[PDB]
């Protein structure tokens, strides 16, 4: 009998699926967060366009699997107290046609016994801190990772060290320790437990999909650390923290990475006439991150060639990449932050740049005209007729250096007089000291 | 001035009785624990047929102590703090003629020098987790059981282990491993305590009287581990758990257990026409347990004088039962469990089932004729003219077994053909493989 | 070493190296968690399942992997010896089947000191030891009839199959059932003892019922010289005919039968 199960429980922790005689009992009422694991299931579900396998972790009284069987899905719940197991297969029998397996088990173990494929989704609500409790974070980081390995999504409610018990002391400084080497995650929410007032985090985390409300997609591969970098099989998602965990961002660096950000949306969605830039196709922003994707450019990164001492031609790269910031500038845009690692390759040597957070739009622009020098420097120490092109440029009245100047003197330098026959000669040593 | 002696209490624990200025400022309000109580009192006080003498451990502000002597009873208050006890002795002087006492003394040594009839009542609301953390779990049951010893009835609420905090890791692993070793005890409530989510259940225990809300009776002896049999002057009470502690029911166990107490109320209160079935005087179900109160038979269990190797008619024995399972069969009833632990034999060697728990109204009934073979077996192997009446019944077409052919076979055994004198044989080998 | 390893999914032993460390050599493994790496095919497997005897599943086939060499107390050298035989059988079975009885194709197979291999082509269905025990709706006729048949059509051509259980029985969507582990088949009072345990199959399956248990005491009147397969299927079919067990005396092979069980 039902009633009998449920008073053996040790605790009530959750709402009895279909039995509302005891939600004035249950620790938790649950609603809130199953509105929300509800939405992350139909997303991932719409997806992968079909009905999803949910694995549930330390599933108590069944609630969320029973919820979810309901929806269609076929779950299967894990709890290490008989009693929990017990209500759960009387809750699934009253409920035949749910798709729905409870089993007595430890979740260290469960995780270790997972096969890639067979779960879609896994949740693991307020349970990994008993874990960390006893077994410590490396090992949890660990399980966590080969739960993200072998799902497609794992949704994660996370205690923390602030809550007042004495097992807040075992935690980790910030819950995201215990995720942050997965490759995607993003907070979702945040969830008031009854035992406090410091509420719990909940986390979607993926090792294989971007997982953005708007935009629900596997990546192949993705790198950085408070930008991450997803790229799918024709874009890249570039991901910002504003919100990261530790001493990680001072207040004006989350401030730098917002602004960065947005300026990148605004700049891609409204593109200057003249001016070929990547197509947006999501973006979003929060509180703690935002997000953007593009169609994926080909290429290598400058940067990388240069340090993998890959062949570069110089001439096609420096034209190319001048061109288009003399484009810019005649329609009153100019690139703050010029560097090898903002620009990309493509296999014919021509160049285009890749990062617009640093997209301004108002002696300007002397100081840009003259970090330019630099980085012609870096990706070389100049030989005729460079250096030739930038004495002709130091001659110039301040007042009329600019993009378009720099254009026009580059592609002349062949014909500029010969730098070495003048006294000449200080820019040289200008320019080679900032560097 | 109380307002003072209120100021001074480390905390207002309870309702200020007389006082509710405070009643927003009391951790705990108590009305929901007082009900309880003064139900429970009220019905100990009927059953003794007058005012009770109360003892209340830890009593803190003396709510429940000075709620009580309102109603009558002369009340013992302890506390080991003064504070509570000064407080506890200016309410008694608002009330003059509630007969109220309060000491500082701890619960330890109190409860060394209690004696038996001093107090009816004991309550112990909230306090012993402290003893149990201090003290250990082994001198919290002596304590308990010394104190149920020395009263008619004692009231526990009790902390567990699933509270958050620090102290809960010194708890028992359930709260019922404090009190077991006491005769009799029925979870009676469940309580908030604004501390956390986690409700603290409510006791009644007694060593002396089953305190069933219909039936209030002292009893002198006691025996088993989830069903408990009380034995009073002319009762047994047949107590059965549904929810034990530990690992000790599985889901099916706790089921069959509510099926046969359940069986057992429903076949008692109709009993067939033509059966002599122990007069029912009292029964209840609840969620963790169900009570039988029945007339006591007199004898002893079948199973206690085979085992004490006490002498036995197992002709008076088999007939007598062979005569009630025929009866019973007649009517459309059949017993599912004949053991010698089912078996209760009077003086003239006559016997009765006592476990009708295990009474089913629907090749039947050939199993049960079957189980029968071993039990005469048991009972004593066979020799003539038993022996011969097991070979009749085996000639038997299996459609005709059944109680009456048995009965019927069974008093004209010493007239049926010698067994050994034919092939025979077989069932022999076949009942005595089974045993 | 293999504790190691032994939580992934497939791993095999590939050769043994010396160190010039010292005399004792150090094994190398190939693991996956994806794929079945057995020199012949090479292929992913989407699920795989149990300890030594692995299953690993792919679109269209089923590899059984067997560890002879097992680590710890595991196999006993006779265990080692019943595995290493019952796989050598299976793969002779499988490559030459009876006429007759419609075997799994066999798609690879090898044998070496420690383990060994079949891959076959994968039937569809549940096994029924897993409808009895998520106790899913089963026809018993079907099953029964079905499985007899091919039990009888193995007899018919010298084969017999020493261990006939519901984990060795797989039942498909029309609940028609077959044996899947073939390297309990035998080709040598034969076949009683076999006929035996059948009761008992079919008793666990369910105890009887009329017709079945009619079946059974028809049998139990036959003497036993002529107990076997083919009469099994021949009062199996007849079984609504037979006479009504319960109006014999009768009665014994009720009894003998919930005994061993
Ligand atoms: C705080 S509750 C959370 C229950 C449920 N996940 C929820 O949030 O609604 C933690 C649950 O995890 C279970 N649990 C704790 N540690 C576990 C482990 N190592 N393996 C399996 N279950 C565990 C407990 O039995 C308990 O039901
Ligand atoms: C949590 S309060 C409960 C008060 C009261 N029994 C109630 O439930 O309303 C525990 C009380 O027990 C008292 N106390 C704790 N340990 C004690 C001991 N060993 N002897 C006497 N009093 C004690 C404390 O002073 C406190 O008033
Ligand atoms: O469109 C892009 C294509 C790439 N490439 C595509 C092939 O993989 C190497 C990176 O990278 C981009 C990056 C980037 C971020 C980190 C490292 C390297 C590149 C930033 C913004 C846009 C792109
Ligand atoms: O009416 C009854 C009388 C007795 N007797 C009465 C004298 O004391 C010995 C037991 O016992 C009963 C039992 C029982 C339970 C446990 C042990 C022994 C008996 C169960 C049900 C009914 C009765
Ligand atoms: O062809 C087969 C198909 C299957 N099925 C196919 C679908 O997955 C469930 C198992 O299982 C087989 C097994 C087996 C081994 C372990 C568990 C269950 C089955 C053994 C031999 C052959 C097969
Ligand atoms: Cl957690
Ligand atoms: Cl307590
Ligand atoms: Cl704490």
Excluded at 289 to 304: C, I, N
Excluded at 399 to 406: D, K
Excluded at 415 to 434: D, F, H, M
């Amino acid at each position: 009998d039902l009633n009998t199960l449920v008073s053996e429980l040790p605790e009530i922790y959750q709402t009895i699926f279909g039995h509302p005689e005891w939600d004035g009992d249950a620790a938790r009422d649950c609603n809130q967060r199953l509105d929300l694991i509800t939405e992350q299931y139909d997303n991932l579900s719409r997806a992968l366009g079909r009905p999803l396998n949910v694995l549930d972790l330390g599933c108590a009284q069944g609630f969320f699997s029973l919820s979810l069987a309901s929806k269609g899905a076929t779950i299967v719940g894990i709890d290490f107290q008989q009693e929990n197991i017990n209500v759960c297969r009387a809750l699934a029998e009253e409920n035949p046609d749910f798709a729905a397996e409870f089993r007595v088990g430890r979740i260290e173990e469960v995780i270790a016994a997972l096969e890639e494929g067979e779960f879609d989704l896994a949740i693991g609500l307020s349970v990994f801190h008993h874990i960390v409790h006893l077994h410590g974070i490396d090992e949890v980081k660990r399980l966590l990772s080969r739960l993200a390995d072998v799902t497609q999504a794992v949704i994660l409610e996370l205690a923390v060290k602030e809550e007042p018990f004495y097992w807040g002391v075992s935690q980790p400084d910030d819950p995201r320790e215990l995720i942050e080497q997965c490759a995607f995650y993003r907070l979702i929410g945040e969830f008031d437990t009854h035992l406090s007032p410091v509420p719990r985090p909940m986390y979607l985390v993926s090792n294989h999909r971007v997982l953005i409300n708007d935009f629900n997609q596997p990546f192949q591969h993705w790198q950085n650390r408070s930008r991450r970098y997803f790229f799918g099989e024709d874009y890249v998602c570039k991901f910002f923290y504003y919100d990261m965990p530790h001493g990680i961002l001072t207040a004006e660096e989350s401030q730098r990475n917002k602004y960065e950000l947005h300026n990148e949306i605004k700049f891609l969605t409204q593109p200057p006439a003249g001016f070929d830039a990547p197509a947006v196709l999501a973006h979003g922003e929060n509180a703690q991150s935002g997000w953007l994707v593009m169609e994926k450019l080909p290429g290598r990164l400058l940067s990388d060639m240069l340090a993998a001492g890959e062949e570069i031609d110089r001439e096609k790269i420096l034209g190319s990449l001048l061109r288009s910031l003399a484009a810019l500038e005649k329609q009153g845009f100019w690139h703050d932050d010029v560097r090898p690692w903002n620009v990309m390759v493509d296999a014919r040597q021509h160049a285009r740049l890749i990062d617009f957070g640093s997209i301004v739009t108002t002696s300007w622009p002397t100081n840009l005209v003259q970090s330019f020098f630099v980085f012609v420097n870096e990706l070389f120490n100049l030989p005729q007729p460079w250096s030739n092109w930038l004495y002709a440029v130091w001659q110039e009245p301040v007042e009329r250096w600019n993009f378009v100047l720099l254009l026009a003197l580059f592609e002349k330098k062949a014909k500029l007089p010969s730098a070495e026959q003048q006294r000449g000669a200080t820019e040289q040593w200008i320019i080679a000291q900032e560097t």
